Amino acid sequence: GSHSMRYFYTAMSRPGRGEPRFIAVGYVDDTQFVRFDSDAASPRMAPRAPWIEQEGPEYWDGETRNMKASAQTYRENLRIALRYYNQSEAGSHIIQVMYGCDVGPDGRLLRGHDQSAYDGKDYIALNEDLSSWTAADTAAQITQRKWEAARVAEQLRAYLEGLCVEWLRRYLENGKETLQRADPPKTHVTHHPISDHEATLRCWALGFYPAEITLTWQRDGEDQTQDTELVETRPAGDRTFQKWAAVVVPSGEEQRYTCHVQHEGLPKPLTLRWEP
C-alpha cells in the first residue's frame, strides 16, 4: 500500500549539565532504521534495521556529518528560542522536529511534512503546498519571516519531492521482506467476572504490523464507543504491536457483544465474540 519515511529530532537543553543533547531517529512506516545520539561515547548515525546495513561508508559518513551539523544548528535554535520567548538561560527547554514524505503504491509523492515544536507545543509547520508556512505564535512568525526571505520552503520541497521519495523507494525495495509485509493480528476475547452481575469482556489483538488497527465493541450491533476502555497500541519488541479493548457487560448478556477488528493484514474485517 502506501508508505512513509520520517525523521524525528529532539534537542534538549540542560543548563549546568553541558550542551544540549540531540537525538535523531529515522523510521520507514513503523520500523525504526537509524539513530543518532550526541551523548553517545562515539556519536554516529547508526543502523537499527538489517536492510540499512548494506549502505556503504559514504552513506554513513554523510549521515553522521549531517547529524553533527544538525545538532549544532539546534543548539543555536534553542538559544534563539530563549530570545523569542523572553526566557532565561537557567531553564531546560526542548525543540522537536518531524519531517518526511508519504508515497502511494506506485511510489509517487502523496504529501510531504516538516513540522517543529518548542516545549511540546506547535511552533512552525510547512503547509501541504510545500511552499508556505503556518506559525503558531508571534515568535514562530519571526522564524517564518526569516524562512520566507531565505526561500527555505523551496529547498525543503526539493528534498521532499526528490531525495526523500527516492531514498524511501530504495529502502522499501531493500527491506521488501519486512517493510512490504503486513502481519495480521491474532485475536481472541477473554472473560473476567467482576461481580455476580457484571463481567469484563476484553478483545485482544496481538502480533500485528503495522501499528494502525481499529478494535470496536458492539452491543446488539451498536458501537459502544463511549463505554469502551481502549489501551494505547503498544510495541511487543519483536516489531509487532498489541492492543486491547474492554467493555463491562451484564452477566448473562455476553453473547449480545461482538468485537470488530480492522487491520491492513486482514482480507476482511473480523467479527469475534466470547467463546465459553
Binding site: 529515522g26 549531517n66 551539523a69 544538525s70 543555536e76 528560542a81 519571526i142 527555505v152 529547498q155
Partner: peptide, 9 residues
C-alpha cells in the same frame, strides 16, 4: 536519507 538544515530559527 536525512536532509540538511537550511536556516536557523
Amino acid at each position: 536519507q536525512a536532509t540538511q538544515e537550511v536556516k536557523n530559527w
